Design a protein around this ligand. Structure first.
Ligand SMILES: Nc1ncnc2c1ncn2[C@@H]1O[C@H](COP(=O)(O)OP(=O)(O)OP(=O)(O)O)[C@@H](O)[C@H]1O
Ligand SMILES: [Mg+2]
Lengths: 397, 58, 42, 30, 884, 61
């Protein structure tokens, strides 16, 4: 098979005070990018290589004709005829021409067919419809485990699930435990589930596929399951890979007897997702990560030990994790010496990582209100109740 | 083309009309001078709507 | 089976090639149960 | 207390003065 | 609109310059305005400055037209006008703001020139003035380096600004003064370096580690040529001296990068002090397994600095580190079983069934098994499997099979002074040519950087250095060259140069002589240079063209002049230009081989400009190969920041679309560029997909080898998986591809080993280690080196290798089992805090254990705290008042 | 070659298996004059006035 993807540039992020160590490293990166540009522009400047076979390729192209429609090879027959489905959904019993790679023909791979008198004239290993191409991550997110505060147990678990099998896995089969096929992160909103997925996609060595869950559902009949199948086929093809499906409850709700056609199609799409999850062996190097807020509303078959063994909990940050997050998000701020930040943490509340980030942003805004950028402690004091909107007083004492 | 299916022109990016209508092409006639009170609210909006857009440098 | 898998997971966590009874205890604490039962029942 | 919206001179001075000497170079390089 | 309530500022600071004539009013308004500007910009944290924004517009006409002021007093009112005009500098004036500095703040100094400036925190004349005197002063140095006094009084002003930057705020602004020092004094940077040295060394001591890290990371990426890289190398030397703690082994590091200047800097960095040698200075010697000549130049000649002058030398040479390696294998950490090739070659259960025999004792696979077994048990005395009984096993190959099997047998007892000699005494009288050469190579192989006082290799091989047999000469010279890898003693030169200048031998012998001799020395050794050039002249064109060994001649010269800058390469290029067009290849080798860590644009710019793209249509073989291979030379580890986008460079630009014969195999660069085992970064995509792509044969063979890079201790899981997935199931039919697959993907079991040039600290490479370049050119050639068994000694020449272990002692032995913290590296040091290199514990191993480069450790419970702070696998746990 | 072939015909095999032949219509004077009677109004409508009320209404509009 082919190899993974998601190329990223240098981490940099060693200096941040803009002390020309940043400038020197960035100038080195820019110099290398310049040599990229110049080298390829020179290579295209002189590169005469074409024709050669020509005639045989010309006549095979004439045989193929123009245009050529792509379909899905649903089934094969004796090695001259096959069953191919056009993107509309109609499949036909067609013939297979000699110049096709009989080894490449398998149920599922896209086949180039003749526009008139349909007949398999080619195989496309890179169909990758625009949607599933979009779901594949190209530029790694700039966030990383340095940006994540706390969640040390969560980071440990996610790395033990998706990284350790990717890196040296000998511990797994040495203990004989099958690697955890699939992991579901869950917790209250803005705890860091999507942030952890970003950090995983940063420090990665596999094709990362970001999905929205609600993205899978498609209007046309059978488009949903077909897209799910395409996504997982791309995952296997570019294995090792990580398939992140954020907001799994967009489809993961409890399965109930469908009545309307649309609900039947949703049930079909989830059934196909579950079937694809079961399809690949856990020994395979393709893992899935599903994040959600309403874990209690998920179907209790998606989270079966035979399908998703692990269940990572993302609890609201503790006081030490709260101060860790505050330190992280205040790194780029020019805080004064009067600020302590301890009063905000000590206040018994339900701050989250998102809440703390917003508190820092609003403190910066309040400082900008006073025409300053040093950000006093009073700025944080105001910002805390500015962003934290909304037990009867002395009932409990 | 007709049925030869030959790429013969590149068109602007695909936006289906259901969202293409959601542009405010005809700007409405409502000024802050027509808004009583809400001065604090207007400032709080402006600190998020156009201050980040006009000058993200701060 | 998942409990045994998590016991192996915890053994790997400490990088110990042999899983211990402590590892199985943490595994069952995690998987099973998804003060109250000790401050009233004794 | 009615807070004052930043004026043009305010914005212009904010982007300077309390800036790192290498702001332009680093941002341009990125 | 305006504030209204504070509408006095747009009036009084507006009319005061507007009304400006009468001198008393001038002085009064100027003094009052100075007081207001100070009261505003001094303490008020408000970045906004009310007067600064309200002095603009009118200032550009009033404070500019009133700038003359006709000087009614001698200087006082003019000084007041300048102090005023130095307030609204940033925005009110144009980009010639440094011009405002010149004719406002430079031309005159208001007593204490920073009376209204030094009080300001960072903005008014510290960051802004710093910018002015790193832009104007830099340009004036570029054009008029020796200008008027406007070049020296600005120097004292900038020095005062720099020191104040540490003692006006005492904040993290300490990461600016050296930086300014770098940009300021573009030509005379050394004066700024001495200024900051005399400031910091007497100022405060913990604010010195920040200075060292700043200088280190600026060293990693300095300006393009080594005119200031050397200067910033020299800058922190006082900061390492008694001006900081005395132990500070960093001297070696800080002397290793400057062309490994031993006899110029080592004479005084650690040789002058010699007062705390009983402390970690002994392990400073121990962590110096690079420049044994340095220990010769101090210990042996004097023998009176300390009692442990020569016993320490012997124990830290190899004997005690070898004993530590053995005990680490046996006594406490028990992964020392008998591991032969067959025990895991058939690790795949598919290979059990369907074989239908398939057991052939042919030369290729027997050779591969011998190589694998030799590598796996490297420096292991326990391989009593293919050593004593299997003498017929030594026999069951072709002629070169004898040579390579005996070479691997020697490799088993790596740097074994006693055991290696007592096991090679049996094979010394082999009664066969090729086995005799293998025994010579084995004698030279137990001497890998050994620097034995008895010197067995020289006497034991001088019989066969020039004896009338090509294979005897090859084996002897290879063994001795591997023996004298570090030192360049005159005896081996006087012995080998006549061999090198001899005409009885074929150029296979001449090239291996060039490799050995140029690998002996890493300095100048002009005699070797002269021999190389005369040989390149005295040989006839077809010989230096198409003999398949001409590549080795320039390699020796390059390895001699590796590390040193273009100062010698200029004359080398001048002299080499008079040769046959093959010299172009030699050019593109020797120049580019002269730099180990020289991350710069113009050198690789030429590599990618005149040698890459001006050759795409060119059919000149092996010219682009060295170019793109050594693209990663001078780039192997500039803190590895330069490596990633270089990987992007070759994978995207070179491998994907490069020449099918000169660039399609841009892959042993990955062998040299980075090697730990990294999917989709160094091996998985870039090597695996090329390996499955067997469309090009030499590409397949070479990138199947290329995992030898990550191979040192790859934790073969997910790497052996490749072997099992491609042994039998992959390139099984191809004899040569299968052989090199076996070699590479099965000499992974070699435990506690590391071949990379980068040292344990990581900021300094190892010129002795970098001598594993001959099995890159030779491995790329593949004709008579690897694919053709013309000469397989290069595949043994990997005695540029260090134990990847971590071990600790306290003046006695390894008995210390202090809890350690080996884990992935993170952000540390130069940031707001030197956070621990390990973000967490990971593995909590207390015993001495493996420590790969992407692993670092931190001491525990503040107990027996090491002072080395480099942890070069030889930590010393010198105790103190622990738990105060 | 005064007329260009159509894409629709070309994909269905034009200039590969069959060629288009130019078509000209043989219309003599007699046939054209006979066909002219299809809309030849009359000798009467040249003399019939518009409905005068309708004419006035059209003028007004
Ligand atoms: N532990 C943390 N440390 C630092 N920042 C955090 C942390 N947890 C959350 N954040 C911040 O919260 C922001 C939003 O978090 P994220 O997108 O991961 O939310 P989530 O918990 O997955 O919630 P939801 O799925 O309900 O949107 C992140 O951009 C990050 O800045
Ligand atoms: Mg989220």
């Amino acid at each position: 098979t082919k190899g993974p993807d998601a190329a990223s540039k240098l981490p940099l992020v060693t200096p941040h005070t803009q002390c020309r160590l940043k400038l020197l490293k960035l100038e080195r990166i820019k110099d290398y990018l310049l040599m990229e540009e110049e080298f390829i522009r020179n290579q295209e400047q002189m590169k005469p290589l074409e024709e050669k076979q020509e005639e045989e390729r010309s006549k095979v192209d004439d045989l193929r004709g123009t245009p050529m429609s792509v379909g899905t090879l649903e089934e094969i027959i004796d090695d001259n005829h096959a069953i191919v489905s056009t993107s509309v959904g109609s499949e036909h019993y067609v013939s297979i021409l000699s110049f096709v790679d009989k080894d490449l023909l398998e149920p599922g791979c896209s086949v180039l067919l003749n526009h008139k008198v349909h007949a398999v004239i080619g195989v496309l290993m890179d169909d990758t419809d625009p949607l599933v191409t979009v779901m594949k991550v190209e530029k790694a997110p700039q966030e990383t485990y340095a940006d994540i505060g706390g969640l040390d147990n969560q980071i440990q678990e996610i790395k033990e699930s998706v990284e350790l099998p990717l890196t040296h896995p000998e511990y797994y089969e040495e203990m004989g435990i099958k690697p955890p096929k699939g992991v579901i992160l869950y917790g209250p909103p803005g705890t860091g589930k999507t942030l952890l997925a970003k950090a995983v996609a940063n420090q990665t060595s596999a094709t990362f596929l970001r999905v929205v869950g609600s993205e899978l559902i498609q209007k046309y009949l059978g488009d949903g399951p077909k897209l799910v199948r395409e996504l997982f086929r791309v995952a296997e093809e570019h294995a090792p890979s990580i398939v992140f499906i954020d907001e799994i409850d967009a489809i993961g709700t409890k399965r109930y007897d469908s009545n309307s056609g649309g609900e039947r199609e949703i049930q079909r799409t989830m059934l196909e997702l579950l079937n694809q999850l079961d399809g690949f062996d856990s020994r395979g190097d393709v893992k899935v990560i599903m994040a959600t807020n309403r874990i209690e509303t998920l179907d209790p078959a998606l989270i079966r030990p035979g399908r998703i063994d692990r269940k990572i909990e993302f609890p609201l940050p503790d006081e030490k994790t709260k101060k860790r997050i505050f330190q992280i998000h205040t790194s780029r701020m020019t805080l004064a010496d009067d600020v302590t930040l301890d009063d905000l943490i000590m206040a018994k509340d339900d701050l989250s990582g998102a809440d703390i980030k917003a508190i820092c942003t609003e403190a910066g805004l309040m400082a900008l209100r006073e025409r300053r950028m040093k950000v006093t402690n009073e700025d944080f004091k105001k910002s805390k109740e500015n962003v934290l909107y909304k037990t009867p007083e002395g009932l409990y004492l | 083309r007709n049925d030869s299916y030959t790429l013969h022109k590149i068109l602007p990016n695909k936006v289906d009309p259901l969202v293409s209508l959601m542009m405010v092409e005809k700007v409405p006639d409502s000024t802050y001078e027509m808004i009583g009170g809400l001065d604090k609210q207007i400032k709080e909006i402006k600190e998020v709507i156009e201050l980040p857009v006009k000058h993200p440098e701060l | 089976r998942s409990v045994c898998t998590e016991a192996g997971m915890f053994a790997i966590r400490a990088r110990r090639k042999i899983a211990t009874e402590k590892d199985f205890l943490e595994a069952v604490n995690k998987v099973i149960k998804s003060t109250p039962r000790y401050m009233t029942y004794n | 207390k009615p807070i004052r919206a930043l004026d043009e001179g305010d914005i212009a001075l904010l982007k300077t003065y309390g800036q790192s000497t290498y702001s332009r170079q680093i941002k341009q390089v990125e | 609109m305006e504030e209204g309530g504070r509408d006095k500022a747009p009036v009084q600071p507006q009319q005061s310059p507007a009304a400006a004539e009468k001198p008393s009013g001038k002085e009064r308004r100027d003094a009052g305005d100075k007081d207001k500007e100070q009261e505003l910009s001094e303490e008020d944290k408000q970045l906004q400055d009310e007067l600064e924004m309200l002095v603009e517009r009118l200032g550009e006409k009033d404070t500019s037209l009133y700038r003359p002021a006709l000087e009614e007093l001698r200087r006082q009112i003019r000084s007041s006008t300048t102090s005023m005009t130095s307030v609204p500098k940033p925005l009110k004036f144009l980009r010639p703001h440094y011009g405002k500095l010149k004719e406002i703040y430079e031309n005159m100094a208001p007593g204490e020139n920073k009376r209204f400036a030094a009080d300001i925190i960072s903005v008014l004349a510290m960051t802004m003035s710093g910018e002015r005197e790193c832009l104007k002063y830099r340009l004036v140095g570029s054009q008029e380096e020796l200008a008027s006094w406007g070049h020296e009084y600005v120097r004292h002003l900038a020095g005062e600004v720099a020191k104040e930057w540490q003692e006006l705020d005492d904040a993290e602004k300490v990461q600016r003064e050296p930086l300014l020092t770098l940009v300021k004094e573009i030509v005379p940077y050394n004066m700024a370096h001495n200024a900051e040295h005399e400031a910091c060394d007497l100022l405060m001591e913990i604010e010195q580690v920040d200075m060292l890290e700043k200088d280190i990371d600026e060293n990693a990426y300095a300006k393009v040529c080594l005119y200031l890289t050397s200067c910033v190398n020299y800058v922190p030397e006082p900061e390492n001296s008694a001006l900081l703690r005395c132990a500070l082994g960093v001297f070696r590091k800080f002397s290793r990068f400057p062309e490994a200047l031993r006899l110029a800097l080592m004479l005084n960095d650690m040789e002058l002090v010699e007062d705390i040698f009983t402390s970690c200075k002994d392990v400073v010697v121990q962590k110096q397994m690079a420049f044994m000549l340095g220990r010769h130049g101090v210990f042996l000649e004097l023998s009176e600095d300390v009692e442990e002058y020569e016993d320490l030398t012997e124990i830290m040479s190899n004997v005690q580190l070898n004993s530590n390696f053995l005990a680490l294998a046996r006594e406490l950490d028990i992964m020392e079983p008998k591991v032969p090739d067959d025990i895991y070659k058939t690790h795949l259960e598919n290979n059990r069934f369907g074989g239908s025999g398939s057991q052939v004792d042919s030369a290729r696979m027997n050779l591969a098994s011998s190589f694998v077994n030799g590598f796996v048990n490297a420096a292991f005395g326990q391989d009593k499997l293919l050593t004593d009984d299997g003498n017929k096993w030594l026999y069951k190959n072709k002629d070169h099979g004898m040579l390579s099997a005996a070479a691997s047998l020697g490799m088993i007892l790596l740097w074994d002074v006693d055991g290696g000699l007592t096991q090679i005494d049996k094979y010394l009288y082999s009664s066969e040519d090729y086995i005799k050469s293998g025994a010579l190579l084995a004698c030279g192989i137990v001497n890998s950087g050994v620097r034995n006082e008895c010197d067995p290799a020289l006497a034991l091989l001088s019989d066969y250095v020039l004896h009338n047999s090509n294979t005897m000469r090859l084996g002897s010279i290879f063994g001795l060259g591997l023996a004298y890898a570090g030192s360049n003693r005159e005896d081996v030169l006087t012995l080998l140069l006549p061999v090198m200048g001899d005409s009885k031998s074929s150029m296979e012998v001449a090239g291996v002589t060039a490799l050995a001799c140029g690998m002996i020395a890493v300095g100048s050794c002009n005699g070797d240079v002269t021999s190389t050039i005369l040989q390149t002249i005295m040989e006839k064109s077809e010989t230096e063209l198409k003999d398949t060994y001409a590549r080795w001649l320039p390699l020796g010269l390059g390895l001699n002049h590796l590390g040193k800058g273009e100062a010698i390469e200029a004359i080398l290029a001048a002299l080499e230009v008079v040769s046959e067009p093959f010299r172009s290849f030699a050019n593109t080798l020797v120049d580019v081989c002269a730099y180990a860590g020289s991350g710069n644009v113009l050198k690789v710019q030429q590599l990618l400009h005149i040698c890459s793209e001006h050759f795409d249509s060119k059919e000149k073989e092996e010219d682009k190969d060295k170019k793109e291979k050594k693209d990663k030379d001078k780039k192997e580890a500039p803190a590895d920041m330069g490596a990633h986008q270089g990987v992007a460079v070759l994978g995207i630009a070179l491998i994907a679309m490069g020449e099918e014969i000169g660039a399609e195999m841009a892959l042993r660069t990955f062998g040299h560029l980075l090697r730990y085992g990294e999917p989709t970064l160094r091996r998985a995509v870039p090597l695996a997909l090329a390996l499955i792509s067997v469309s090009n044969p030499r590409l397949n063979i070479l990138d199947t080898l290329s995992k030898f890079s990550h191979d040192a201790d790859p934790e073969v899981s997910y790497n052996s998986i490749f072997a099992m997935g491609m042994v039998g199931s992959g390139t099984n039919n191809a004899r040569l591809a299968a052989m090199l697959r076996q070699l590479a993907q099965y000499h992974a079991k070699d435990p506690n080993n590391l071949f990379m040039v980068r040292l344990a600290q990581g900021l300094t490479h190892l010129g002795k280690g970098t001598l594993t370049l001959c099995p890159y050119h030779s491995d790329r050639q593949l004709m008579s080196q690897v694919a053709v068994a013309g000469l397989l000694t290069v595949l043994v020449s990997f005695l540029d290798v260090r134990n990847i272990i971590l071990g600790k002692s306290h003046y006695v032995l390894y008995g210390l089992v202090a809890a350690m913290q080996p884990r992935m590296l993170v952000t540390f040091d130069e940031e707001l805090r030197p956070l621990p290199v390990s973000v967490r514990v990971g593995q909590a191993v207390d015993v001495v254990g493996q420590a790969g480069k992407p692993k670092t450790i931190t001491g525990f419970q503040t107990h027996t705290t090491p002072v080395l702070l480099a942890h070069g696998e030889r930590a010393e746990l010198a105790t103190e008042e622990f738990l105060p | 070659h005064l007329n260009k072939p159509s894409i629709q015909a070309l994909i269905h095999g034009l200039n590969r298996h069959y060629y288009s032949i130019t078509i000209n219509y043989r219309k003599n004077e007699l046939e054209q004059k006979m066909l002219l009677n299809l809309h030849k109004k009359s000798w009467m409508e040249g003399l019939t006035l518009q409905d005068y009320s309708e004419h006035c209404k059209h003028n007004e509009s």
